[PDB]
Design a protein around this ligand. Structure first.
Ligand code: HEM
Ligand SMILES: [Ca+2]
Ligand SMILES: [Ca+2]
Length: 199
């Protein structure tokens, strides 16, 4: 028989949302109202440059399967720290806004797709509550429309998609965005090594 093996490498450029990074690193979430400040930490292969509205993230491609590009990496945002004592080891447990996205997956079919993410985010209850984390594994955070159909049999792919928050994503982001809210666009920078085997 004739078999096709596709090995996909590369990165995805996805800032999540510029105005969210601007707010989180700014004086509302991490200014003079709070004794302890948080910010943004990245891990597991994410690269980042800039701060606030200029911040960018690149996420490493782990590989592909039929209809999906699997990314690695994690980003953690923290703000609105509710703790004002003198024990700094308490601060990490007291950020009212405490959001983590990791291992995004881009599912696709032609020029449509879905952005899946592992998430851990405190629920927004009110401004005086450190609420319990909401969590999800490969949850649908956004829908995607690409500027061309995704074809992983092409060796070099650079394609950008617009993203819109899902109903699931509404609760992840504290209900501050409505369903359908635009998020940052996602660019896939892929190299697809296609090997045909008679085997
Ligand atoms: C003490 C608790 C909180 C306070 C006082 C607070 C305050 C604010 C304020 C005043 C804004 C509007 C800023 C602007 O429009 O320029 C805002 C925006 C926002 N907040 Fe928070 N917030 C809190 C908790 C949270 C939580 C837990 C989340 C969960 C992710 C969250 C997510 C957001 C988002 C997504 C926006 C929109 C940012 C944008 O414009 O892109 N907030 N918050
Ligand atoms: Ca070539
Ligand atoms: Ca292109």
């Amino acid at each position: 028989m004739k078999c096709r093996v596709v090995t996909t490498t590369g990165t995805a450029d996805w800032s999540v949302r510029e105005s969210f990074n601007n707010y989180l690193e700014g004086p509302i979430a991490n200014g003079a109202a709070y004794k302890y400040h948080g910010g943004i930490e990245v891990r597991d292969g994410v690269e980042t440059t800039g701060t606030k509205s200029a911040r960018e993230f690149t996420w490493p491609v782990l590989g592909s399967e039929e209809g999906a590009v699997k990314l690695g990496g994690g980003v953690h945002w923290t703000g609105h720290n509710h703790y004002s004592g003198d024990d700094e080891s308490q601060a990490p447990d007291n950020f009212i806004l405490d959001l983590d996205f990791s291992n995004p997956t881009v599912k696709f079919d032609g020029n449509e797709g879905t952005l899946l993410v592992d998430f851990k985010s405190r629920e927004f209850v009110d401004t005086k509550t450190v609420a319990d984390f909401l969590t999800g594994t490969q949850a649908e955070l956004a829908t995607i429309t690409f500027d061309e159909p995704i074809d992983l049999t092409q060796e070099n792919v650079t394609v950008t998609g617009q993203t819109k928050l899902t109903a699931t994503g509404v609760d992840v982001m504290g209900t501050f965005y409505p369903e359908g809210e635009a998020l940052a666009p996602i660019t896939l920078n892929l190299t697809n090594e296609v090997v045909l085997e008679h085997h």
